[PDB]
UniProtKB/Swiss-Prot annotation:
Protein name as catalogued: NADP nitrous oxide-forming nitric oxide reductase
Top-rank taxon, per record: Eukaryota
Cofactor requirements of the protein: heme
Triggers of expression: By nitrate/nitrite.
Protein's organism: Fusarium oxysporum
């Protein structure tokens, strides 16, 4: 069995292994860092099955759970939040924070999302690029999602820049382990103060709702409120940053589609749909252990065996998505959902928010900056390391 995770074939490409597995070995065993095994599931139909089967568990205290790194094994010791829960605990906790993220809530947030994007673009414009390129990541792709989720959580405006920087340190490839861990605990300590404050004087934010609706009645404790808030911050932010950067790069890669998007910003939703399929920037989250034997395709997954269901591979499944390796914002979509946000009850809580952020970016960026260009050759883009999820570290631009 080959070692997993696999490395991407090149900066912007999926691992090469998946297409071969879909063709000849769609349910197969891989070897994890600890020498254990796990079943890797590569076809769309089977990924959806894994994501929804009640015979499979997300609880990380089950032997067989496919931890992919030493750090993941460590992390599984803590008290879980809803990301790692099964029913009925899962929705009991997730429903505490769902309201902000519903389709209707996100539609009503659109003016705020637009204003946030607009303001960050105007700052660019004012900073300019007269002395040479600026980094679209630092100036734009990072602060857009960060400012939004911090604001929704309850962070006041004057603390956004510093906290945006500190959360980036958690995941920056250049951070040492000490720097990343110190930033993690710094953010937790910060959120703990905000919970104390909002318990005394609630405001218009997610932490206040946790405090009033869950902490005060005794349904959760203050520490639980901190960890739920922290999950909402860290689960998606680095993925959002990467998706923005990858979208800009992809448009540059495919000039005629950029021309189409400038000419018609109403194409932004379908651009974003294609982006979230083609660049599956969170590919390692659909993991389970079997609670009892389960058949998947021509394989038997025995009780206490682990499963990794690749939504990245599902999103390139030729049986579902015709010409899957073509980026086509005018794609004729099938009935089956793309899986950029997962599937089933655990499907990304923030899918509607994330798509609204991305649609706002891609309907606005090239109206603001019709001459935006990546300022290095596309083949020189600095992608995330190939043994990680797809992403872009920095992206020099002019405009
Ligand atoms: C384009 C950006 C994003 C992508 C592609 C993405 C993708 C995903 C994926 C693949 C999962 C796993 C779902 C499953 O288990 O089937 C997930 C879960 C989750 N995401 Fe996102 N995410 C994004 C942005 C966000 C944002 C902005 C937030 C928070 C504000 C967020 C919060 C979460 C949470 C809390 C979960 C766990 C849900 C659960 O297990 O019940 N995500 N996301």
């Amino acid at each position: 069995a080959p070692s997993f995770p696999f490395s991407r074939a090149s900066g912007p490409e999926p691992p090469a292994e998946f297409a071969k597995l879909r063709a000849t070995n769609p349910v197969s065993q891989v070897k994890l860092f600890d020498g254990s095994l796990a079943w890797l599931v590569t076809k769309h139909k089977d990924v959806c099955f894994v994501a929804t089967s009640e015979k499979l568990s997300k609880v990380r205290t089950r032997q067989g759970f496919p931890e992919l790194s030493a750090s993941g094994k460590q992390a599984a010791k803590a008290k879980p939040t809803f990301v790692d829960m099964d029913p009925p605990e899962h929705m009991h906790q997730r429903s505490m924070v769902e309201p902000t993220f519903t389709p209707e809530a996100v539609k009503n947030l659109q003016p705020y999302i637009q204003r946030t994007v607009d303001d960050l673009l105007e700052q660019m414009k004012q900073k300019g690029c007269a002395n040479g390129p600026v980094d679209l990541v630092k100036e734009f792709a990072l602060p857009v999602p960060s400012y939004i989720i911090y604001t929704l959580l309850g962070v006041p405006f004057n603390d956004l820049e510093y906290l945006t920087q500190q959360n980036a340190i958690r995941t920056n490839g250049s951070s040492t382990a000490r720097e990343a861990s110190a930033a993690n605990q710094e953010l937790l300590d910060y959120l703990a103060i905000l919970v104390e404050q909002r318990l005394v004087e609630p405001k218009d934010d997610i932490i206040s709702k946790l405090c009033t609706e869950q902490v005060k009645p005794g349904n959760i404790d203050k520490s639980d409120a901190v960890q739920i808030a922290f999950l909402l911050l860290v689960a998606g932010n680095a993925t959002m940053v990467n998706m923005i950067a990858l979208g800009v790069a992809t448009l540059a890669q495919h000039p005629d589609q950029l021309a189409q998007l400038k000419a018609n910003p109403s194409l932004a939703p379908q651009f974003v749909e294609e982006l979230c399929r083609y660049h599956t920037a969170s590919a390692l989250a659909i993991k389970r252990t079997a609670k009892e034997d389960v058949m998947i395709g021509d394989k038997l997954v025995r009780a206490n065996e682990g499963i990794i269901a690749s939504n990245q591979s599902a999103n390139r499944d030729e049986e579902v998505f015709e010409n899957p390796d073509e980026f086509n914002m005018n794609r004729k979509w099938p009935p089956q959902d793309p899986l950029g946000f997962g599937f089933g009850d655990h499907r990304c809580i923030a899918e509607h928010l994330a798509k609204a952020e991305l649609t706002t970016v891609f309907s606005t960026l090239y109206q603001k900056f019709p001459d935006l260009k990546v300022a290095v050759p596309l083949g020189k883009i600095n992608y995330t390391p190939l043994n990680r999820d797809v992403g872009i570290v920095d992206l020099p631009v002019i405009f």
